[PDB]
Amino acid sequence: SRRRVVITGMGMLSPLGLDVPSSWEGILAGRSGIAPIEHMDLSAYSTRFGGSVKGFNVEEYLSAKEARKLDLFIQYGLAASFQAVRDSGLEVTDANRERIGVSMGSGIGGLTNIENNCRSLFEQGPRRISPFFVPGSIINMVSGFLSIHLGLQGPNYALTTAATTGTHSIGMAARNIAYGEADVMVAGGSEMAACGLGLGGFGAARALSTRNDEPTRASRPWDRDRDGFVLSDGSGALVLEELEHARARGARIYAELVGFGMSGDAFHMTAPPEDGAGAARCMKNALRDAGLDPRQVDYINAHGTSTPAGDIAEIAAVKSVFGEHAHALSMSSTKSMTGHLLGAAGAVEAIFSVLALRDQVAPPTINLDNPDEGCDLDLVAHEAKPRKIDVALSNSFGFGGTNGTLVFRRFA
Amino acid sequence: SRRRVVITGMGMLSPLGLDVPSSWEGILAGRSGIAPIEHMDLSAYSTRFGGSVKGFNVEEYLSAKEARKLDLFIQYGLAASFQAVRDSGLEVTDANRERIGVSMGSGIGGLTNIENNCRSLFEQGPRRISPFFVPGSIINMVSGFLSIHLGLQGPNYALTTAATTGTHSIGMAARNIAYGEADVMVAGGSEMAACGLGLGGFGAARALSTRNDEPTRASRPWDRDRDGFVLSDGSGALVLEELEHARARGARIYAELVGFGMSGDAFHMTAPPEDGAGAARCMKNALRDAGLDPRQVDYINAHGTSTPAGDIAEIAAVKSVFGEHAHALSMSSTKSMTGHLLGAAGAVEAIFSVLALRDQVAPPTINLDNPDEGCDLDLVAHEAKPRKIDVALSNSFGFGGTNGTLVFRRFA
Ligand SMILES: O=C(O)CCCNC(=O)c1cc[nH]n1
Ligand SMILES: O=C(O)CCCNC(=O)c1cc[nH]n1
Numbered sequence: 001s002r003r004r005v006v007i008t009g010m011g012m013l014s015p016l017g018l019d020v021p022s023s024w025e026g027i028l029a030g031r032s033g034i035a036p037i038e039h040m041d042l043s044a045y046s047t048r049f050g051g052s053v054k055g056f057n058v059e060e061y062l063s064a065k066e067a068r069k070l071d072l073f074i075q076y077g078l079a080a081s082f083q084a085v086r087d088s089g090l091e092v093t094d095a096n097r098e099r100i101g102v103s104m105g106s107g108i109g110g111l112t113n114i115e116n117n118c119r120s121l122f123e124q125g126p127r128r129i130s131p132f133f134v135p136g137s138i139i140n141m142v143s144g145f146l147s148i149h150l151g152l153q154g155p156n157y158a159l160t161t162a163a164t165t166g167t168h169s170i171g172m173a174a175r176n177i178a179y180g181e182a183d184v185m186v187a188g189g190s191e192m193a194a195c196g197l198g199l200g201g202f203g204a205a206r207a208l209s210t211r212n213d214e215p216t217r218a219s220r221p222w223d224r225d226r227d228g229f230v231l232s233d234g235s236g237a238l239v240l241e242e243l244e245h246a247r248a249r250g251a252r253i254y255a256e257l258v259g260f261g262m263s264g265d266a267f268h269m270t271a272p273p274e275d276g277a278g279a280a281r282c283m284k285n286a287l288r289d290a291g292l293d294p295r296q297v298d299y300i301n302a303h304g305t306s307t308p309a310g311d312i313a314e315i316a317a318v319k320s321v322f323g324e325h326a327h328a329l330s331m332s333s334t335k336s337m338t339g340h341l342l343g344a345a346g347a348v349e350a351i352f353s354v355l356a357l358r359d360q361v362a363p364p365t366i367n368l369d370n371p372d373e374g375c376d377l378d379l380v381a382h383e384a385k386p387r388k389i390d391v392a393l394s395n396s397f398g399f400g401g402t403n404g405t406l407v408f409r410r411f412a
Numbered sequence: 413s414r415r416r417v418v419i420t421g422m423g424m425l426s427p428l429g430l431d432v433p434s435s436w437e438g439i440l441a442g443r444s445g446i447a448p449i450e451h452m453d454l455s456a457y458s459t460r461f462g463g464s465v466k467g468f469n470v471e472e473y474l475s476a477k478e479a480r481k482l483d484l485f486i487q488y489g490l491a492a493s494f495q496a497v498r499d500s501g502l503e504v505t506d507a508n509r510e511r512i513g514v515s516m517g518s519g520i521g522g523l524t525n526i527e528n529n530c531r532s533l534f535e536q537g538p539r540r541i542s543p544f545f546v547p548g549s550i551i552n553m554v555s556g557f558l559s560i561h562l563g564l565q566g567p568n569y570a571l572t573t574a575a576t577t578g579t580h581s582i583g584m585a586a587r588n589i590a591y592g593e594a595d596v597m598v599a600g601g602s603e604m605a606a607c608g609l610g611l612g613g614f615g616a617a618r619a620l621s622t623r624n625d626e627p628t629r630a631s632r633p634w635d636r637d638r639d640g641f642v643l644s645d646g647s648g649a650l651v652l653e654e655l656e657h658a659r660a661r662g663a664r665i666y667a668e669l670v671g672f673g674m675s676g677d678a679f680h681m682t683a684p685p686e687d688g689a690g691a692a693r694c695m696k697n698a699l700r701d702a703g704l705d706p707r708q709v710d711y712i713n714a715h716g717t718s719t720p721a722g723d724i725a726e727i728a729a730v731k732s733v734f735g736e737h738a739h740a741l742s743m744s745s746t747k748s749m750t751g752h753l754l755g756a757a758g759a760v761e762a763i764f765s766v767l768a769l770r771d772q773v774a775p776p777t778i779n780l781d782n783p784d785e786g787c788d789l790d791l792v793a794h795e796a797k798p799r800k801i802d803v804a805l806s807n808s809f810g811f812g813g814t815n816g817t818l819v820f821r822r823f824a
Contacts, residue, residue, distance in 0.1 A: 044537045044538050044539060098693065111526075114526055115533075118526070119530075121527075122531060122534060126456050126457055126608055126611070126612030127616075129612040129613050129616040130616060131616045131617050133609070134520075134614060134617055134811070135682055138572070138574055140811070140812050140814060141811070141812055143573075143676075143812060145681070145812070147676040147678045148677075148678055148679065151678045152678055153675055153676050153677070153678045154676065155675075155676075156573075156813070156815070157576075157584075157674070158572050158573055159570065159571060160517075160521075160552055160570050160571070161555075161568075161570055162550055172584070175587070175591075179591070181674070196533050196538055197526065197530060197541065200533060200538030200539075200541040202546060203541075204539075204543045204545060262566075262568065263566070263568070264514070264555075264559040264566065264568030265560075266559045266563045266564055267560065269553070269556060269560065281510065281565065399552070399553070399556065400559070400560075400568065401559065401560065402552060
């Protein structure tokens with residue numbers, strides 16, 4: 001936390017829109033992006049719906065030749081990254097290209113491509129595997145391809161930490177800038193896990209909601225009838241920049257990234273401790289890194305995935321950290337609308353947290369019809385809430401008990 | 413680089429041995445770990461050999477019940493991690509468990525498991541996918557499972573940066589300690605990509621040597637008859653610790669981790685620039701981070717994968733960075749013996765770099781029969797070379813043009 005880090009560009013693909021403003025309009029209207037899945041036939045599946053990206057045209061970003069070599073998760077990551085870089089207005093030159101890097105991650109990476117190449121392998125043998133199978137499927141190729149396309153020669157890496165991926169990606173990129181390893185980073189995450197292995201894998205783990213009769217009502221964080229998360233696809237990217245660098249070029253600054261915290265639960269592979277102790281440690285770590293007291297937090301974009309154990313653990317953790325102030329802040333889960341974008345969740349939610357600061361509005365938790373026992377905070381049920389927001393937190397808690405929190409502030 | 417970071421424990425599985433001392437004995441003897449592959453039938457494949465872990469017994473580390481849920485790459489990562497923690501002598505308690513984290517990565521992750529679940533899916537449908545498919549296959553589950561088994565509640569994450577994974581994992585963990593986010597980290601990487609998709613995928617890219625008649629001679633870095641890398645499996649883990657913490661508990665210190673550097677080539681998805689400019693930037697970054705001049709480097713553990721373009725680019729980069737001193741240092745590729753362990757390569761090579769410091773010996777580049785044009789440095793051809801080593805560098809250059817360098821020093 002030596003140099004200051006601000007956000008100067010954002011980009012997104014989500015189930016609510018093919019860019020940031022379309023998605024945000026959806027969020028503030030309480031719109032659902034969840035529908036029956038169209039791109040595959042799901043009769044053997046217990047979950048037949050999810051949050052797809054609708055109408056994506058990769059040829060707005062890449063040639064058809066380039067695009068056919070890359071898994072969808074890479075296409076989505078590059079689309080968000082290009083949007084964010086364009087949004088920032090930054091011009092890459094010989095004088096600065098060594099100072100600009102990339103940290104775009106994914107939870108599961110190129111599962112569609114792997115499954116398609118596996119089909120070829122099993123039907124017709126190894127000679128039918130694509131030559132582009134490896135570089136078109138490995139998780140670090142969003143960072144790799146972005147760097148090649150834009151001539152970025154700074155730190156170049158990729159995280160994979162399940163639902164925490166996007167949060168880790170952004171926080172670690174911010175550390176690179178704070179410590180002088182880069183002046184600008186493109187950071188975030190992307191996911192497209194809606195293939196048979198993904199839907200079938202999460203379904204085999206009984207992780208997913210099975211509310212096929214009412215898909216838009218399936219994702220219902222903190223609601224007593226919740227029954228697992230909704231699988232969603234897309235990407236989010238931010239342009240993080242050192243403050244004096246941004247000021248010097250006249251950049252538009254959305255917000256300041258002031259804190260990043262991490263912890264491990266060290267408890268269980270998929271279930272949190274019921275008191276959310278690891279989440280509490282993570283949020284405290286983030287606030288201590290920001291030099292902020294818990295009483296200064298106005299809004300939390302929750303992890304809130306619509307799981308029985310997870311949702312109530314996060315309430316417990318918020319109550320532990322914030323004490324009486326827990327009833328003054330607002331906390332919402334935008335996964336009520338978007339579903340769970342896995343490795344992209346923390347990226348799209350960071351963008352929502354920044355826009356909550358820009359617009360002074362807490363996005364809703366839709367579908368919060370009957371809050372569960374102990375779920376008595378301001379969860380922004382049903383409808384967006386205009387309010388004062390100086391400090392916003394975004395939480396991500398992932399398989400393995402891996403936790404991350406980002407803290408954003410209105411800039412001055 | 414605020415607090416100092418030392419190495420207090422190491423662990424490994426490689427094609428040369430099931431622990432560090434066995435592997436190192438192999439390295440110093442110039443032994444090859446490469447052989448015809450036994451665990452699958454490779455008649456449709458143009459490459460039928462590689463570096464397997466021989467004789468691994470997971471039940472030395474895990475119950476059979478636990479082990480059957482985890483992909484081999486996770487089993488290997490946990491084995492190396494447990495070895496390193498035991499080697500360090502550290503006792504985990506309530507007073508320190510929040511200060512101990514994990515950063516174990518992988519390049520490709522659970523490809524064997526994915527392929528086995530894909531077979532089930534295609535023959536018998538999604539109901540035959542394992543419930544443990546997701547948590548047993550995702551890359552962050554080495555960090556996750558290690559943390560749960562040992563009660564580690566510090567920073568908990570995973571990198572995936574192809575051949576740079578292990579190098580990034582260790583350097584980023586060292587940053588967590590240097591900046592006060594942790595006092596101890598277990599860091600490194602693991603890989604088991606020798607399934608049909610892995611051998612077939614790299615073969616489809618024409619990335620691999622096809623010297624099936626002489627497998628032990630296939631990996632021949634800088635040799636004029638090189639024809640691609642040798643695919644290998646295994647894991648490496650280090651216990652990194654803040655220096656005053658190590659001293660206070662009477663730890664045995666192997667070496668100091670003094671520098672870490674990164675860059676991106678921004679050139680091509682799989683080929684480096686012929687002058688190795690990105691590698692040169694990376695090494696300079698690492699040395700500048702260490703506060704060392706190039707003339708202080710005694711040994712380089714090269715990336716040196718046995719590829720036509722890669723090997724000569726790394727020579728060019730070494731000549732650019734080191735000038736006349738390039739002819740005084742020793743540089744070797746231990747991949748001549750081990751083959752290319754992909755996401756574990758940087759981890760096992762960091763361990764070899766540390767042991768070069770401990771033992772004052774440069775490991776050989778075996779098979780360097782006829783050095784190619786311009787390959788006129790001290791490449792430690794054929795036989796290990798006792799010599800003075802105060803500073804050792806380890807390089808990793810990965811698909812996407814992602815580069816990392818670590819700098820180690822004899823400690824005082
Ligand atoms: O932690 C795990 O192993 C599962 C990932 C999901 N975790 C949670 O929802 C959660 C809520 C509060 N703390 N953690
Ligand atoms: O960089 C790539 O895209 C391929 C990975 C391999 N790169 C190299 O061997 C190399 C040697 C010097 N600089 N880079």
